[PDB]
Design a binder for this molecule. Structure first.
Ligand SMILES: NC(=O)c1ccc[n+]([C@@H]2O[C@H](COP(=O)([O-])OP(=O)(O)OC[C@H]3O[C@@H](n4cnc5c(N)ncnc54)[C@H](O)[C@@H]3O)[C@@H](O)[C@H]2O)c1
Ligand SMILES: NC(=O)c1ccc[n+]([C@@H]2O[C@H](COP(=O)([O-])OP(=O)(O)OC[C@H]3O[C@@H](n4cnc5c(N)ncnc54)[C@H](O)[C@@H]3O)[C@@H](O)[C@H]2O)c1
Ligand SMILES: [Ca+2]
Ligand SMILES: [Ca+2]
Lengths: 205, 197
């Protein structure tokens, strides 16, 4: 039983590994990765423990191998197809975020208002949500839900139908879906506490 | 331990919920259990500060440590798609209250926003001190650094950065980067592991 916090740290090592591969760094360690994730080296070695023997020998790790290894663990070895249903303000912005990644790709921006439905979008065009059933299966697994709160639970159930794999949900309402699909809720303001604490702790900061 | 703060935050969440449910008292064994961490640890974290326990007292204690006691002034610099949407987001409330919305777009200055109103950016130094400490930087990559430059001069205490760029700001100013990205992978991993889920 791997802790939820463990997968989040794993997610952090990977991000720290591409940053490393961006500086021509080839091999690293649990001591370096930890100092960068702000955790104890033991924690890095530990989190990796939940998934098999890693960098056993003193040696350490080599950015390339671990980076690959972590991508496999977090399931980032495939290329998930993404869609943003609820093409409003957040939607239009999200739809244009620069660094989505090599394993995540947008392939559909949906929406119900006719005013938009049909306008070009950096890579494709908006389109109604009545085609969700034969636009999702082969190419879309993950749906970014930036639809108004009230509409959320209704646009949500629509996806579960066109067979959506997972839902990254930005609306302030707890979706109701079958175990067949995963829901991850976003909270852009989550970091305000980290910030709050940092302001009161210069010395620490 | 830079990692303790993240746990401490987890504890408070586990507490605020224990309270809402009516539970009166908890212990190191339970907090840990619910926070997926050893009692030894939880008991050790609360050690760096003030030290079973009573959900109400520890909650208040944790909140005081985390800063959530006072009521901070917030603001969004850059009322574009992200920033505009953010304004109408009903998730602040508590100890972070929105008290300003700025932008450079002259055709945006004046827009009636939630009772307030989109100011410009030049008043920051007079509008900031005493009223606002935290700014949600939601401007194009290209701007950001120059934006923060003002904000600092305006006397900003901390920035919650959405701009995908690592800002360069003096030490008196705390910065925190915000990303949805991580939740995507948590999603990714969560899909291939219905068991874990
Ligand atoms: N989690 C956060 O930190 C955060 C911050 C930003 C905004 N909000 C969320 O943003 C979402 C949208 O916000 P916005 O501020 O840009 O709103 P918006 O009103 O500009 O856009 C909403 C869009 O939803 C579309 N829509 C409504 N029902 C739909 C349906 N059934 N299917 C497809 N499209 C539908 C509309 O046509 C519109 O384009 C809300 O869920 C809100 O809670 C959350
Ligand atoms: N972290 C995330 O999850 C996330 C997702 C949304 C978008 N992005 C980032 O959010 C930011 C805004 O995205 P958007 O889609 O709303 O774009 P946008 O073009 O609508 O908004 C940027 C806004 O900044 C304003 N601006 C420019 N220079 C300024 C300055 N010097 N001072 C004050 N305001 C200024 C503009 O007038 C505009 O309204 C970008 O940096 C983008 O890359 C991040
Ligand atoms: Ca595919
Ligand atoms: Ca004040």
């Amino acid at each position: 039983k791997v802790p939820e916090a463990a997968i989040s740290r794993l997610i952090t090592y990977l991000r720290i590994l591409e940053e490393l591969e961006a500086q021509g760094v080839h091999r690293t360690s649990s001591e370096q990765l930890g100092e960068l994730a702000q955790v104890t080296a033991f924690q890095v070695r530990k989190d990796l423990s939940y998934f098999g023997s890693y960098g056993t020998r003193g040696v350490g790790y080599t950015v390339p191998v671990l980076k690959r290894e972590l991508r496999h663990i977090l399931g980032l070895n495939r290329k998930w197809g993404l869609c943003i249903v609820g093409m409003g303000r957040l939607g239009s912005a999200l739809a244009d975020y620069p660094g989505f990644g090599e394993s995540f790709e947008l392939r559909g921006f949906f929406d119900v208002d006719p005013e938009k439905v049909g306008r070009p979008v950096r890579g494709g065009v908006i389109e109604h949500v009545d085609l969700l059933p034969q636009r999702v299966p082969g190419r879309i697994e993950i749906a970014l839900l930036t639809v108004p709160r009230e509409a959320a639970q209704k646009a949500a159930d629509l996806l579960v139908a066109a067979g959506i794999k997972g839902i990254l949900n930005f609306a302030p309402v707890v979706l109701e879906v079958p175990k067949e699909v995963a829901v991850e809720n976003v909270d852009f303001l989550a970091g305000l506490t980290r910030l709050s604490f940092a302001i009161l702790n210069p010395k620490w900061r």
